């Protein structure tokens, strides 16, 4: 957990409905998004951060949490949008004599910033007496090994955790769900869906001066008034179709 692995996912179509076939977990824990809607969205990037904790600490893998893990080992941002997947791995990560291949950081001078990894093995100095790298009074070793055994209770058994963080920026989308894209229809009232941005309106050719890095435009009420087509990089103006009041 103190040296949690991180993998970057980009330039691919992500089908989140096969994640049930890879790990024997019971449900997602998705913050800011719903697990069933993941296949209908495009994200600029995905990050899969994997590690092992024990049962008690699975509750700490969540935005706004505090503890040993959330402070010194693995911290999630308060504005987190993603999904946490944790499953019991007592059959794999537990030995009869004890599994001491998994460790956690117990002491640290200050709390971790979100998504910060600290792999320093320096001796922690609780007091003022210098340690000079040697354990002693008020000189602790910050890393402590979990002792995982098959006879431990469900709260003390190992749990494998994978955190998926969805970077949804203004950049062009790179990770999308399986979704076939139809032909572009202009000058007609249609239900459009650009990279998961859904709406209803009339799409017209535009002469707005989008800079090469921009991808969409907003309005006074933060309503998307222009878009960039993901395939043919042109600028489309979105207009409400047609409506009015009718008096008798």
């Amino acid at each position: 957990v103190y040296a949690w692995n991180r993998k970057r996912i980009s330039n691919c179509v992500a089908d989140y409905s096969v994640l049930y076939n890879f790990a024997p977990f019971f449900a997602f824990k998705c913050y800011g998004v719903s697990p069933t809607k993941l296949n209908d969205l495009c994200f600029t990037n995905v990050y899969a951060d994997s590690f092992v904790i024990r049962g008690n600490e699975v509750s700490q893998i969540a935005p706004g949490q505090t503890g040993n893990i959330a402070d010194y080992n693995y911290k999630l941002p308060d504005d987190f949008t993603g999904c946490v997947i944790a499953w019991n791995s007592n059959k794999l990560d537990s030995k009869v004599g004890g599994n001491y291949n998994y460790q956690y950081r117990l002491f640290r001078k200050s709390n971790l910033k979100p998504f910060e990894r600290d792999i320093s093995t320096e001796i922690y100095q609780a007091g003022n007496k210098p340690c000079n790298g040697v354990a002693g009074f008020n000189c602790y070793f910050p890393l402590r090994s979990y002792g995982f055994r098959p006879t431990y209770g469900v709260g003390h058994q190992p749990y494998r955790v994978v955190v998926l963080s969805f970077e949804l920026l203004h950049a062009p989308a790179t990770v999308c769900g399986p979704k076939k894209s139809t032909n572009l229809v202009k000058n007609k009232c249609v239900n459009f869906n650009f990279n998961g941005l859904t709406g209803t309106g009339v799409l017209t050719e535009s002469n707005k001066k989008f800079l090469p890095f921009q991808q969409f435009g907003r309005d006074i009420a933060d309503t998307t008034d222009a878009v960039r087509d993901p395939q043919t990089l042109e600028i489309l103006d979105i207009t409400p179709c047609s409506f009015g009041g009718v008096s008798v």
Epitope: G97, G98, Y100, Q103, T121, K129, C131, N132, G133, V134, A135, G136, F137, N138, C139, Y140, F141, L143, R144, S145
Partner: antibody, heavy 126, light 107 residues
Framework: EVQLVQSGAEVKEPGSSVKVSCKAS????????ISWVRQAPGQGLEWMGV????????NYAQKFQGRVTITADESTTTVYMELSSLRSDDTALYYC???????????????????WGQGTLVTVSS | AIRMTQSPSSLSASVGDRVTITCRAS??????LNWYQQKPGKAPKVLIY???SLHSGVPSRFSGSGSGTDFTLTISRLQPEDFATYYC?????????FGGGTKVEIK
């Protein structure tokens, strides 16, 4: 508990170096300090240095710095101590021991060396 | 830079007697003192760690106390197998300085 097994005896000459192995049976490796304590014939014990295998380096007392090198082989679960520039005062029994360091919440309880090797008699022949 | 001083260096007692050994530190080490028992030809064994705790398997006759700079190891009833050399070690800070060692002999 954990069992420590060292190598055999050594016969050397002043100006040479000696490498002593200490294989741990196992159970907390890469987090347990493998301390080395030497004992001169008819004299008291003396602490040379300690190594935590995950640190990579080795810490030593302010009497052996500069001529003691301790390294750990994680794959073989063996700790190696290399004492260079041997002299007459380097003939002793060389033990390897494992620290525990149980602390409750304030400083109660300290370190102790429960497992000791059988001892590696190193003789610096003249 | 912490030194440990023992007293006495060699005491001769009988079986069933009470033995008191003192271990003094130059400066306060809290409760990071240990007591080791070494028999000739063998590696030392732990009897007291933390100045007040008994290791697993240690007979109840051994008892340690004290804190700061004054410490004491006490054997309530001496035994024929309790004649050995006793070393007190401080775990406060590097270096771990062993005491001069007290040798308990048969009267």
């Amino acid at each position: 508990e954990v069992q420590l097994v060292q190598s055999g005896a050594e016969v050397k000459e002043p100006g040479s170096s000696v490498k002593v192995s200490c294989k741990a049976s196992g159970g907390s490796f890469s987090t347990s300090g493998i301390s080395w304590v030497r004992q001169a014939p008819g004299q008291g014990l003396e602490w040379m240095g300690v190594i935590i295998p995950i640190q990579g380096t080795g810490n030593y007392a302010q009497k052996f710095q500069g001529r003691v090198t301790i390294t750990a082989d994680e794959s073989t679960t063996t700790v190696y101590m290399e004492l260079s520039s041997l002299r007459s005062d380097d003939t002793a029994l060389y033990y390897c021991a494992r620290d525990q360091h149980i602390y409750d919440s304030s400083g109660h309880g300290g370190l102790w060396f429960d497992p000791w090797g059988q001892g590696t008699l190193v003789t610096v022949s003249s | 830079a912490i030194r440990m001083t023992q007293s006495p260096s060699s005491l001769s007692a009988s079986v069933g007697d009470r033995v008191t050994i003192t271990c003094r530190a130059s400066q306060s080490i809290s409760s990071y003192l240990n007591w080791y028992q070494q028999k000739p030809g063998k590696a030392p064994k732990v009897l007291i760690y933390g100045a007040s705790s008994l290791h697993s398997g240690v007979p109840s006759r051994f008892s340690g106390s004290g804190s700061g700079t004054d410490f004491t190891l006490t054997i309530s009833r001496l035994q024929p197998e309790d004649f050995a050399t006793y070393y007190c070690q401080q775990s406060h800070s590097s270096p771990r300085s062993f005491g001069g060692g007290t040798k308990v002999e048969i009267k």
